[PDB]
């Protein structure tokens, strides 16, 4: 069954508002109100409570959205049964520092470092090399030391394109085991992973 | 009663999409769909057809939305019974051209030149001078020839560093200058290639 007609509306943000039991959707500047029901098509679920609303604003649940992060330009570090996802650029020094902090935590977490060239054509180069690594154990090591170009083996990186599509902004971008997101490096990684 | 809770959603755009007769609202990356009814609070009307969706995407109806342009930093040119609205910057030469072209149309239209300082501090200064001017009779001419700075000012005017006419334009979706609104509401983001005809249809 088809979409027959499409019109872009002058709407740049939407807020869910709850009053006396009913949840409505207001455009960010107060021009439009939509009375009805919102559905998360990627998670294939209706959002019916303010708690579910907050979940999609504050959290990312990759497997729930049909995303396997191991299929991206991803390298893994650690042994924990709690998964931590960190989008990183190969030239990002705060990303490198964050990755250094994660080394002390490898017993309780498994880190998924997803390499994205968010910072340019040279970042593309390094990310592109890592993608073609013979041995991703060394790739991991290469990533953390900023030694990626001398790695044994498109201008438009798929991991970059995907992150952008789904709204990942800036690096580093961290997703805790419970889905909580950190736009940037948290003050204390260990504490942040434990709880809000 | 009270609004008990509020959540900003990860949505940057909404498309009205029509499927099997009903209209739904889809987020920019397709992640979210909202089934239901949209109401336009500025013009106070429900929107139920794809034609009404196109109307709010393509047109601005100042009076329907309760917007009186004469309350803004505005200057009129022409005598005609069809109102044409043009947002301009004082330093915008492309805007001055359009104004010249408009001299020839004063028979059919009245032009409402809405002055906004969108291009920086010198633009701010000139718009503020127009606003605080003792004498608005020559105001049109000063605008078109870019001589607003020599307009004698009222004692002791100061409206503040943030121009309300600019704030209004930004709020209701004016983008760039010049920005033209035809009598029937159609918008032109930039000077149309051919004006008189554009104003026609």
From TrEMBL, chain A:
Residues 1-45 form the Disulphide bond isomerase DsbC/G N-terminal domain. Keywords: Disulfide bond, Periplasm, Redox-active center, Signal. CDD domains: DsbA_DsbC_DsbG (cd03020). GO terms for cellular component: periplasmic space. Residues 78-180 form the Thioredoxin-like fold domain. Disulfide bonds join 92-95. InterPro entries: DiS-bond_Isoase_DsbC/G (IPR033954), DiS-bond_isomerase_DsbC/G_N (IPR018950), DiS-bond_isomerase_DsbC/G_N_sf (IPR009094), Thiol:disulfide_interchange (IPR051470), Thioredoxin-like_fold (IPR012336), Thioredoxin-like_sf (IPR036249). It is found in: Periplasm. Required for disulfide bond formation in some periplasmic proteins. Acts by transferring its disulfide bond to other proteins and is reduced in the process. Belongs to the thioredoxin family. DsbC subfamily. This is Thiol:disulfide interchange protein. It comes from Proteus mirabilis. The gene is dsbC.
């Amino acid at each position: 069954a088809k979409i027959e007609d499409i019109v872009e509306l002058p709407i740049k943000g939407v807020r869910a508002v709850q009053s006396d039991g009913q949840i409505m959707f207001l455009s960010e500047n107060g021009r439009f109100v939509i009375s009805g029901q919102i559905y998360d098509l990627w998670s294939k679920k209706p959002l019916n409570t303010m708690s579910q609303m907050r979940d999609v604003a504050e959290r990312i649940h990759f497997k729930s959205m049909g995303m396997d992060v191991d299929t991206l330009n991803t390298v893994s570090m650690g042994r924990g049964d709690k998964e931590v996802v960190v989008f990183v650029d190969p030239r990002c020094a705060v990303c490198h520092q964050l990755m250094g902090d994660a080394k002390s935590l490898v017993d309780d977490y498994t880190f998924k470092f997803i390499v994205i060239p968010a910072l340019g054509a040279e970042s593309n180069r390094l990310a592109k090399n890592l993608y073609c690594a013979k041995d991703k154990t060394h790739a991991l090591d290469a990533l953390m030391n900023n030694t990626l170009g001398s790695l044994p083996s498109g201008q438009y990186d798929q991991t970059l394109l995907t992150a952008h599509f789904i709204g990942i902004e800036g690096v580093p971008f961290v997703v805790a085991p419970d889905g909580r997101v950190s736009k940037g490096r948290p003050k204390n990684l260990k504490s942040w992973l434990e709880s809000a």
